[PDB]
Each structure stands twice: as C-alpha cells, then as structure tokens.
Amino acid sequence: HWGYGKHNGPEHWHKDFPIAKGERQSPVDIDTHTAKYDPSLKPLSVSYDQATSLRILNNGHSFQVTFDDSQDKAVLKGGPLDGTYRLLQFHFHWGSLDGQGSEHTVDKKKYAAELHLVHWNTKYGDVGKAVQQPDGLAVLGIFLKVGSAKPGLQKVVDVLDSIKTEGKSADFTNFDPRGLLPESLDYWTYPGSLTTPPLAECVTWIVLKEPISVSSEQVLKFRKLNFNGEGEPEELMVDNWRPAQPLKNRQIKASFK
Ligand SMILES: CC(=O)OC[C@H]1O[C@@H](S(=O)(=O)NCCCCCOS(N)(=O)=O)[C@H](OC(C)=O)[C@H](OC(C)=O)[C@@H]1OC(C)=O
Ligand SMILES: [Zn+2]
Fold it and tell me: Domain of 230: which CATH number?
C-alpha cells in the first residue's frame, strides 16, 4: 500500500484516506512571524523519569522505540493540554540529504530530520480509542540539524544495523528519552493530524523551537535502514516525510515571546 515513493507517496494517500485533504492536516509550515504569542499557554510538563522503553522496531515507514504505556510512567501534561498523555513511542522522519527530512518547516526551512514523541490522552483508555478523538493524541516534535553529535541518540544509532529491514525488532530496554531533548521547552502549538495514514485528525501538536544537533555519522546511520523486507529489493528508508499541508482555518500559537 502507501509509502513514500513516486507511485505510493503523499500525493497518493488521499485515495485510500480522504481525510488527507481535511481541515486540520499535518505537518504545516510554521510561519514564525504569523504565530501569535499566547501568554495563557502553560509551560510544558515533560515527566519522563520513570520511562520504560521496551523494543526498537523497523515498521517499513520509520524506526520506533516503544514504551510501557500501561501506567502513568512517562507523561506529557501542561502546555496547551488538559489532562495526562502517556508516552507510547518515538520515531523519526529524515531525508536523503541534510537539507530535507523534517515534516514541519519553519519559515519554509527544512531540517535534516524530525523526532516525534507520541503520547495519548489517558481519559480515552487505549490508543485505538484516542485516535478517534479530536484531543486523543499529543505529539512532541523536535527538529534535528546536522552538526555536533547528540550523545543521548547514540545508543539508538548503534542498534539500527540489527533492524535493517521492515519487520525486524530488538530488545531496547533502559533507554532514557530525556537525552533527546533540547535545553529549551519553548514551543509552537496547533491542532493537527497524524502525518502517516490513517492521517486521523486527533493530534495536538507541540513543536519545539530549539532543534537538537546530531552528527553526520548519526544521520547517515538512519539512511542505511530499508523500507523493504529482507528478500525484497533493497530500497533505502530515506525521505520518509510528508510535506507541509495547507494551514486552512488554524492559528499557530507560540509559548514564547
Ligand atoms: C497504515 C495504516 O493505515 O495504519 C497503520 C496503523 O496505524 C496505527 S495509528 O492510527 O495509532 N498510527 C500509529 C501512531 C501514529 C503516531 C503519530 O504519528 S506522527 N508521524 O503524526 O507522529 C493504528 O493503530 C491504532 C491504535 O489505531 C492502526 O490500527 C491497528 C488496529 O493497529 C494501523 O494498523 C493497521 C494494520 O491499520
Ligand atoms: Zn512522525
């Protein structure tokens, strides 16, 4: 089915997922001069001290680290959110070249990659129910630029050789997602959607202003993954990003001045 190639990529998705042309699709371009400071936004509360990572997995469209979300162990609160959102997984989107790869853009600037920390609203009980709700998910988005290495990313990078192809996974315990966060929690926020099918319009996006820097050797290691399963022709998992979607009847709010 859907993918990121010429014949099954983002321009094709609306045929199977008509919400792709909906009113609150993600990602978007963040026009920094049009985003309005909202002094009523609360500071984000990122509570990751008890996070329990489980597995790392190549799912054919990205690579993800999954966590135990059967208790309130790693939760996102505050900011624009009401209630408690549990961390389910994080994954990345990246490019074939350093000048592209992010899904959100900032004043039309593309970053080399973008990290998504995916959380779901505990009042809906499970993630399958949350994805059917307008406020079911909160995704924390962090941009990646190429420069110095990010030490907290290295333990991820070092196991990617063991999940090269679609359907491979590995034990990934005791990983601390706090090592992937930039210093500042200043953020932009809007109502949006999943950026992969089914593109459900269930996401409060929280996109951090400050990117993290990763090294060229770290991102090169992303680009060695494969979309295909083993035994199928090899096609490099690169450019697994959806481009910016029309903003339509939405305002992006900034938590900073
Ligand atoms: C390919 C497709 O159409 O859906 C792919 C999977 O989607 C995930 S999802 O709707 O929960 N998406 C996974 C989490 C999205 C995180 C947000 O991503 S981003 N890039 O916007 O941070 C769904 O899982 C849930 C809980 O709804 C699907 O449903 C099931 C029953 O597993 C679906 O799996 C299948 C076989 O359809
Ligand atoms: Zn994503």
Answer: 3.10.200.10
